[PDB]
Amino acid sequence: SLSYRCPCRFFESHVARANVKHLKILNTPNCALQIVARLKNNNRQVCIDPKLKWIQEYLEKALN
Amino acid sequence: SLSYRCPCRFFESHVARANVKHLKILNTPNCALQIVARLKNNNRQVCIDPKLKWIQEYLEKA
Ligand SMILES: [Au+]
Ligand SMILES: [Au+]
Ligand SMILES: [Au+]
């Protein structure tokens, strides 16, 4: 609950790296992993699909 | 903006300090400060009013 819900209704998958100004990993309880991006063309905030290949490589270039 | 929303739809102003098991400030762009609490016996996760005096009394110790 009523008061609390996950900030991402769904994940968007047609967002290109060149379009995103910032990326943030939301740490909200009882919610799956959530990456939030600040945009261009619109400039809004979107929840991006973590399975995006470019997000994967980006998150993977954080070590092994 | 069709996908992202603030995780708190409203704040709960009647919760007592005795009832809260855990508190967590949420990192959340384009939203006001938001505090999530886990309730003691039923374990529900609720958004609680930052304006609550005991919440202040805690954040003012920082
Ligand atoms: Au962001
Ligand atoms: Au438009
Ligand atoms: Au919590």
Side-chain angles (χ1 to χ4, degrees), chain A residues 9-40 43:
Chain A
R9 278 185 207 83
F10 57 88
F11 301 149
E12 307 197 25
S13 60
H14 281 268
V15 187
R17 161 198 247 248
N19 216 16
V20 319
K21 198 187 296 199
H22 189 261
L23 284 163
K24 199 137 167 271
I25 291 157
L26 262 41
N27 198 22
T28 56
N30 297 155
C31 297
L33 180 273
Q34 281 160 324
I35 323 265
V36 167
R38 191 139 46 83
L39 268 179
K40 287 273 91 279
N43 195 240

Side-chain angles (χ1 to χ4, degrees), chain A residues 2-12 24-30 36 38 45-48, chain B residues 1-12 24-30 36 43-48:
Chain A
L2 275 181
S3 81
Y4 176 71
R5 73 227 161 144
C6 297
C8 293
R9 278 185 207 83
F10 57 88
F11 301 149
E12 307 197 25
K24 199 137 167 271
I25 291 157
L26 262 41
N27 198 22
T28 56
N30 297 155
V36 167
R38 191 139 46 83
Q45 207 88 32
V46 291
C47 297
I48 33 133
Chain B
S1 292
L2 31 151
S3 58
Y4 176 78
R5 67 211 167 158
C6 301
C8 300
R9 212 152 63 130
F10 65 97
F11 293 139
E12 311 219 46
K24 205 200 278 185
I25 288 154
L26 295 178
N27 86 90
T28 289
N30 309 327
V36 172
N43 216 57
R44 292 181 303 268
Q45 225 91 20
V46 301
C47 291
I48 56 168

